[model samples]
Target: KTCENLSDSFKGPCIPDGNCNKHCKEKEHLLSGRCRDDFRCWCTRNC
Candidate 1:
């Protein structure tokens, strides 16, 4: 399973997964990132 949480550093509208993914990995050190239906950037990692 995986754990997901809203990105602490991402704000405003989310455009692409790659953008969010980069921030999560580079800044937050998470495994991955995704853009949800609510237009929020969420970070993911193995639980």
Candidate 2:
């Protein structure tokens, strides 16, 4: 429960303890756990 307490109304890449791999890196798939539901990650290919 982080990413600034998970209320950026998250559209993509919100990582604090909600861990979108710390908001895009590590070969930058950005995020995915099949579009989140406490999966909490996004931005698969956004330049």
Model 2 segments more than 4 A misplaced: 1-16, 29-35, 38-40, 44-47
Tell me the whole-model lDDT of each prediction, alpha carbons only: 0.80, 0.40
Candidate 2, position 27, lDDT:
37
- Give candidate 1 misplaced runs (Cα > 4 Å): 12-17
Tens digit per residue, CA lDDT, model 1, 1-44: 88999988576666643778888999878898877667677899
Candidate 2 whole-model C-alpha lDDT, 0 to 1: 0.40
> Which stretch of 10 consecutive residues in model 2 shows the poorest summed lDDT?
1-10
Model 1 backbone overlap count: 0
Best by lDDT: 1
TM-score of each: 0.68, 0.23
Model 1 lDDT, full chain set: 0.80
**TM-score: model 2 vs. ground truth:** 0.23
- Most accurate candidate by TM-score: 1
* RMSD of candidate 1 to true structure, Å: 2.1
